[PDB]
PDB file as gemmi writes it, atoms N, CA and C in Angstrom:
CRYST1    1.000    1.000    1.000  90.00  90.00  90.00 P 1                      
ATOM      1  N   UNK A   1       1.156   3.830   0.593  1.00  0.00           N  
ATOM      2  CA  UNK A   1       0.150   2.972  -0.006  1.00  0.00           C  
ATOM      3  C   UNK A   1       0.639   2.494  -1.374  1.00  0.00           C  
ATOM      4  N   UNK A   2       0.041   1.404  -1.835  1.00  0.00           N  
ATOM      5  CA  UNK A   2       0.406   0.837  -3.121  1.00  0.00           C  
ATOM      6  C   UNK A   2       1.880   0.425  -3.093  1.00  0.00           C  
ATOM      7  N   UNK A   3       2.567   0.875  -2.053  1.00  0.00           N  
ATOM      8  CA  UNK A   3       3.976   0.563  -1.897  1.00  0.00           C  
ATOM      9  C   UNK A   3       4.498   1.204  -0.609  1.00  0.00           C  
ATOM     10  N   UNK A   4       3.828   2.273  -0.206  1.00  0.00           N  
ATOM     11  CA  UNK A   4       4.210   2.983   1.003  1.00  0.00           C  
ATOM     12  C   UNK A   4       4.327   2.025   2.190  1.00  0.00           C  
ATOM     13  N   UNK A   5       3.633   0.902   2.072  1.00  0.00           N  
ATOM     14  CA  UNK A   5       3.650  -0.102   3.123  1.00  0.00           C  
ATOM     15  C   UNK A   5       4.094  -1.441   2.535  1.00  0.00           C  
ATOM     16  N   UNK A   6       3.582  -1.730   1.349  1.00  0.00           N  
ATOM     17  CA  UNK A   6       3.916  -2.972   0.671  1.00  0.00           C  
ATOM     18  C   UNK A   6       2.895  -3.290  -0.424  1.00  0.00           C  
ATOM     19  N   UNK A   7       3.190  -2.806  -1.622  1.00  0.00           N  
ATOM     20  CA  UNK A   7       2.312  -3.031  -2.757  1.00  0.00           C  
ATOM     21  C   UNK A   7       0.879  -2.621  -2.408  1.00  0.00           C  
ATOM     22  N   UNK A   8       0.772  -1.499  -1.712  1.00  0.00           N  
ATOM     23  CA  UNK A   8      -0.528  -0.989  -1.311  1.00  0.00           C  
ATOM     24  C   UNK A   8      -0.846  -1.472   0.106  1.00  0.00           C  
ATOM     25  N   UNK A   9       0.117  -2.173   0.687  1.00  0.00           N  
ATOM     26  CA  UNK A   9      -0.047  -2.696   2.032  1.00  0.00           C  
ATOM     27  C   UNK A   9      -0.930  -1.754   2.856  1.00  0.00           C  
ATOM     28  N   UNK A  10      -0.617  -0.469   2.766  1.00  0.00           N  
ATOM     29  CA  UNK A  10      -1.370   0.538   3.492  1.00  0.00           C  
ATOM     30  C   UNK A  10      -2.776   0.696   2.913  1.00  0.00           C  
ATOM     31  N   UNK A  11      -2.822   0.892   1.602  1.00  0.00           N  
ATOM     32  CA  UNK A  11      -4.092   1.059   0.916  1.00  0.00           C  
ATOM     33  C   UNK A  11      -4.636  -0.299   0.467  1.00  0.00           C  
ATOM     34  N   UNK A  12      -3.943  -1.347   0.889  1.00  0.00           N  
ATOM     35  CA  UNK A  12      -4.345  -2.699   0.541  1.00  0.00           C  
ATOM     36  C   UNK A  12      -5.331  -3.243   1.575  1.00  0.00           C  
TER      37      UNK A  12                                                      
END                                                                             
C-alpha cells in the first residue's frame, strides 16, 4: 500500500 502496489495503489 502507499507503494506496495503503486503510490497506495493497494490502499488507494
